[PDB]
Structures are given as C-alpha cells and as structure tokens.
Design a protein around this nucleic acid. Structure first.
Lengths: 94, 180, 94
RNA sequence: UCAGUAACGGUGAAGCGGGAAAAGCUCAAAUUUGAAAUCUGGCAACAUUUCUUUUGUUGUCCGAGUUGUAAUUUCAAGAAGCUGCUUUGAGUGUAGACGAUCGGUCUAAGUUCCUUGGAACAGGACGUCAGAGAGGGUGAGAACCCCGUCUUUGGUCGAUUGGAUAUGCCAUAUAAAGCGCUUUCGAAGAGUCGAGUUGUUUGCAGCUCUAAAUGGGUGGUAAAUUUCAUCUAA
RNA sequence: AUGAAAGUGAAUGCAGGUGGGAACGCCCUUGUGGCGUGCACCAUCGACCGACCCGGAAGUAUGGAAGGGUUUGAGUAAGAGCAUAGCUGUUGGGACCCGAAAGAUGGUGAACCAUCUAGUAGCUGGUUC
C-alpha cells in the first residue's frame, strides 16, 4: 500500500493486524486416528480393479498409459496424479 | 398480476403499532439493539461508514465481555465478520465501551448487586441507541499546511507508469525468470 | 379529465464522477470560502472531492490565486499544473 | 435502487447502497467403562386443570436399548490438564398494581305556544344542551320524542387470565457452568462430489464410470496453469 | 465528451475575433440618419478536448511532452435541466364496439359440456350534441 490506487502493492496504507486462524480452515488436516483407520480399511478392503490394472503398468514401467487411463477413470488431472503417486508409494512399500 | 398499493397507509400504521407494542412489551430495555461501525465493501462506497450486523469475536475479547454475556445484555455478535485493520478493532471497541458505560443492568433475584451489574434501578429509561450511540461518518481533515514535497510529486510519475508497471509486471516477471 | 378530451367533441362525427477546477471552490462550506479565499494565511484549505462523490478532478476553468490542497483519487494531466500556479498543492488519496 | 443494465437472442437478472425485521442454533463423527447414568408401557398413590373432559409427578413392575439410550462437543469451535473471579430452582400459596377479552350496568337538554296539514319532524315566536350539531327511527327537513353519539385510552361489576412486584413455603446446592492459560488433540456427513452422455426448464433428471484430505466448492488473478481470496456441501 | 476498448477526457484571445445582427442608449440634442453597443443569435471563423496519422522534451523496458495535419464530434468556449398537471400523436396491453372455421386441457354420453378465449378479424356492419 503506497497510499495509492494502482500497482501490485495497491491499497490504502495501514497497519494490518495478524488475524488468527479459524477452525473452518482446519479441514483437510490429517488425524493420526483417521490416518490409522484409512490404513486399516486400505489393508482389509483391497483395491478396485482400475487401480489394480494401472499398478503393474507402473511395475512394467508403463507410466504414460497408466496416467492416461487413470485420467479417463476419474476425470481430472489432479485426481489422476494424486492417485498414481499414492499407488507408487504402495508399490515401493510392498 | 397487478400489485396495487392501496394498503400503504395501512401497512405503515401496522408497523407503528408493531413498534409501540414491541417497545411497551420490553419497555425497560432499548427498542433497537446496537450495531458496529462498518465500511461498505466496494470502491464506490468504501469511504462511507454504515452499521453492520454484529461485533466480531476479536472486539468482544478486547472489550472484556464474553460472547455469552454480550448476547444476554443486547450486544449482537457476528461470527462471519473478521476485522483486520486495527482501527476497525478500535472504532468498534470504545463503541462497546461507551455502550457498557451508559448501560445499567438490573440485578437478578430481588435486586442484590451481583458482580458489577448495577445498584440503582429507578433509572429505568428506554432511550434511542442512535442518540447516545450515533454512527459518525469518516473524520475528514481541514486546514493542513505545507506538503510542498508533494508539490514536486507530479502525480502521473506514480499513476501513469506504476499503472503501466502493474500492467506489465506479469510480462516483466516472466522475462526475469526466463533469462535466469 | 374526460370532459376536455376530443371524444366529447366527436359525438356525431363517428465509477468516476468528474469535477473541474471551476467547481472545487464551490464544494467548501460557505464560511470556509469566506474566511479562507483570498487571505494570505499560512495554512491553506483542503478539498476532498471524494466526500462529494467525485472520482477524478478534471481541469476545466480558471482558478482564484488562493492556495488550496486538493485530495482526490484520479486527476487529469492539466488539472494538477493549474493548481501549481494557484499556489496550492495536490496530493493523491489512496 | 441497481436496471430495462449485464447477459442471451424479444427475453432479462444479480453484487453493491438505502429501508422493513432482526435470533439464534441442534445432531453424526471420540467412552462413563468405577457402574445405561436413558427411555415407552402395566399397576398403586400424590397432585394439577380453560377442563371431574386436561396435564403431569412419585413409587413399583415390565419391556425397549450395548448393531448404543444419556452427559460433554459441532469448526464461531471444542475436548483434556492448569488458575481465581463470577454466578445459579425447569419449583409452590397470599396481597397489590398492570394490561386482554367477553358478560352486564350508568350517560345533556322543549316535545312550550300560533299558522298550514290526515299527521309538525314544516314556518314563526320564546328557550335549552353541547367532550353530545355522526347516524337511524318515529304519520313530511327532529341536537333537545326515541335509540344512540360525546365523556369512554372511564366508572362499576363478574369471570378468568399477561407476566412482572412484594410476600410466604419448599428446594437441595457434597453442585455445574462462563472466562486467564494451554505442554495437543482436534474426529467434521460417498453411488456423494465430479466427469462424459441423453432429455427438459446454469438447475434438475435417466444412463456408464466414480473421487479425494490442506482435501473439496467457488471466484479475482495469473497463466491455461497459477497464485490469491473466500466458504466447508452431500 | 471521445474512443471498439484500454484510456484520455473540453474558455485562445475582455471565455474571442469576423461581419452582421435585439432593444437600448447614443446623439446632431429632433428624429431620420448615424454613433454605437452588441443580447439571443446568425453565419463564418480563430481556436479548446477525444479519436486518426507523423514525431518522440522529458520523467520513473516504460513513458509521454513540444510541434505538424484542415480527417473526425448534432463536442468545450462562461452550463439548463429536474419534477408535476393538461392537450395532442404514437407503441403495447381485450384496446372503439360487433361478428369466421377452428385448436388445446379436463370432463359427460354412446357427439356433447366447461374452461383456456374478451383468439387469430390483413375484413363486414355500426360508432351518440
């Protein structure tokens, strides 16, 4: 804020006070309890066929096809990349 | 279909009797609750000051009253609003402070003063809150001297080029990361 | 009124508002103009056009030679120089 | 009001501003495991009533319920440890005031003379009341014959009720809660969101696929990705 | 106000002259005529702002000035509009009144009924001192 109207600093020049963090923003945070529960359900429930198919695609280094196929299954790139990275961590964990 | 307004005097009289009946129902306490001093959110109206919904949890914490006591004694609380400029902290604070100063709380359970509510009770009076607590507009300045350093400040040196600087900041930043 | 009508004679016969320098001195309270215009006072009057719902101060008109500070958001490219030789100052509202 | 504006191609909003009115909240997601502390119903008593017609309480029994009834918590938070201030009933008769309604009751002064007329409520003379000269009736234009109108936001008399005021009696109160602090923990709603597809007026719906935890929705930005802002759906 | 939009954003010259131009003054003391003055204006023009084109003083890649157009605007140039009522005209609502088969929805009976309907009316007829 240069006491002015324009620029990538613009605004009326004041002393901003550091506002506290509100509990609504807490969403998405991991709980060791729920992280444990998700571990249990992952180990007991298993996997749907489509992630099964893509993981030996990672196993035989068929990465690009698996990424495209994961995109087709879910719909968005971020969901697809989020999927494959967690399966890969499962792959190295195994 | 065709909305006619032949009831306009009638509806106005209904509200009057609504206020008079409401006020007479709770006569000791003021008819209208207090509201904070808040600024309209846009470049057209941001200079003005108007009355908001309630005082944010920051202000009640500063004013020394809990969010429970405030609701009981007629101070509305707004949780959605958050106040960031510490003047908005301020301007609402003494607003709560002077409201508490002029506030008189009748003791519960047969008029034995509890904590610091009050001792006198004959001072029961129903007053307009905007009288004791009017909302003011922005304090404008008058008769300030010198600022010949701003004289040499030739406006567009900021406006014209910083506006261009803002416009070209993205392209400039892309340039710097490119040749790096 | 039907009686005057022609039917009663045919029976049978089938955001930036703008302010120019000729108007800044009209935005003062009249006592401010009375006691501050034309007097060689050390302190000059201050005009906040934004308080009259005006965004940009254009520069049309002549000025009295009394120094006066004008507070504004935007200003035309001649409106500032005219107030230079008017003895007053222009500084920009944030 | 924006505004017949944006948008669409005649249809046609919304944010902002002013005003009317304002009031906040409850669950699921964790335990109390040193006690299912919870709840319906049957039976015996105690009551209370707009009310013999209603509404409960106590005791006892039985069943419901650990595939979860209570207490605590709902993101504005909050839980668990620490601190010293503050507080507290889901009660019960009497008196007085306050209003709501109904039920009733109380409301000032010419019908005095002459003429016309079937009839005076007409015309004339002489008066009266008026917080009452709104209206209606009475054998024709009636303030004073009558009902009414005004006083009336009232006097009276019932009946209940409005909840406050005082008072009296029980209560149980070994109590719980608010806020300084945290040495931290924070669970947060799935055939749902979403994507493609078909219909219909972005919304919804059928169909196949089908999620995630700083994730997800939504936008200013960027860039086509990004930061940033704001909110926390099912 | 201009520009498609970013964006910029209007007295030349007693806020002009150029001629003229209202009444007045103003007479030469008659009046006429002139002296004028010039309102609305009027035409012209000098110009003043935006767009268009050429040029880049500067000032923090950015950027703008001075200056050159006879290209542009129902532009500025000492604001004239706002509200209410009436008249008249026009557009839309049943739309001056009356009148065509038809069509839809839902019913009754073995075609009819009620609503939509006060329809399509480019016409026929009528339309008041």
């Amino acid at each position: 804020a240069p006491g002015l109207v324009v620029g990538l600093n613009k605004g009326k020049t004041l002393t901003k006070r550091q506002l506290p963090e509100r509990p609504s923003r807490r969403k998405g945070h991991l709980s060791k309890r729920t992280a444990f529960v998700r571990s249990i359900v992952r180990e007991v429930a298993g996997f749907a066929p489509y992630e099964r198919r893509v993981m030996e695609l990672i196993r035989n280094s068929q990465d690009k096809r698996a990424r495209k196929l994961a995109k087709k299954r879910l719909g968005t790139l971020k969901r697809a990349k989020g999927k494959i990275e967690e399966l890969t961590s499962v792959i190295q964990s195994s | 279909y065709v909305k006619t307004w032949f009831n306009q005097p009638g509806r106005k009289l209904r509200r009057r009797q609504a206020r008079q009946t409401k006020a007479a129902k709770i006569a000791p306490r003021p008819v209208e609750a207090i509201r904070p001093a808040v600024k309209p959110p846009t470049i057209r109206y941001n200079m003005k000051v108007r009355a908001g919904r309630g005082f944010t949890l920051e202000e009640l914490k500063a004013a020394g009253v809990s969010r429970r006591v405030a609701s009981t004694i007629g101070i509305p609380v707004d949780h959605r609003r958050r106040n960031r400029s510490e003047e908005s902290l301020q301007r609402n604070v003494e607003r709560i402070k002077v409201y508490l100063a002029h506030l008189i709380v009748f003791p519960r359970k047969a008029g034995q003063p509890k904590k610091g509510d009050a001792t006198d009770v004959s001072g029961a009076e129903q007053t307009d809150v905007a009288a004791v607590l009017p909302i003011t507009q922005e304090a404008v300045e008058e008769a300030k001297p010198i600022t010949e350093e701003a004289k040499n400040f030739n406006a567009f040196s900021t406006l014209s080029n910083e506006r261009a600087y803002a416009r070209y900041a993205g392209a400039r930043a892309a340039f710097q990361k490119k040749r790096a | 009124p039907t009686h005057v009508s022609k039917t009663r004679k045919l029976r049978g016969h089938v955001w930036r508002p703008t302010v120019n320098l000729d108007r800044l001195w009209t935005l003062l309270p009249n006592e401010a103009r009375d006691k501050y215009l034309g007097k060689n006072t050390e302190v000059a009057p201050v005009i906040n056009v934004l308080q009259s719902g005006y965004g940009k101060v254009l520069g049309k008109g002549r000025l009295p030679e009394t120094p006066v500070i004008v507070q504004t958001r935007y200003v035309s490219r001649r409106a500032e120089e005219k107030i230079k030789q008017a003895g007053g100052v222009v500084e920009l509202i944030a």
